[PDB]
């Protein structure tokens, strides 16, 4: 991000936490209290459900 006049170098980790998180944090799914994810599949128009 920057090179100080003292010669030291500022890295992104010096000013931030870098991790793998999520694009969004608004939806939290719990199955019987345990953390969970899942797929809310929807049937296409005029399609067999079975």
């Amino acid at each position: 991000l920057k090179v100080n006049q003292d010669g030291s170098r500022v890295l992104l980790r010096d000013v931030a936490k870098i991790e793998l998180g999520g694009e969004n944090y608004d939806i939290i799914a719990e199955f019987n209290g345990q953390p969970a994810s899942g797929l809310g599949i929807k049937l296409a128009t005029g399609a067999n459900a079975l």
């Binding site: 998180g21 969004n24 944090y25 608004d26």
Partner: protein, 50 residues
Amino acid sequence: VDVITAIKAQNAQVAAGQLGGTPPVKGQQLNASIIAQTRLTSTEEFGKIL
């Protein structure tokens, strides 16, 4: 060019964020959307563009 730049800078919609958005702090109780610069509404506001 100056007029167009001023009108584009001073008549715009700007995304701001959220108070107490996700991922939040553990004890957060309040959540509110942050409103920021929005489009002008009247000839009077346009005339006051600097």
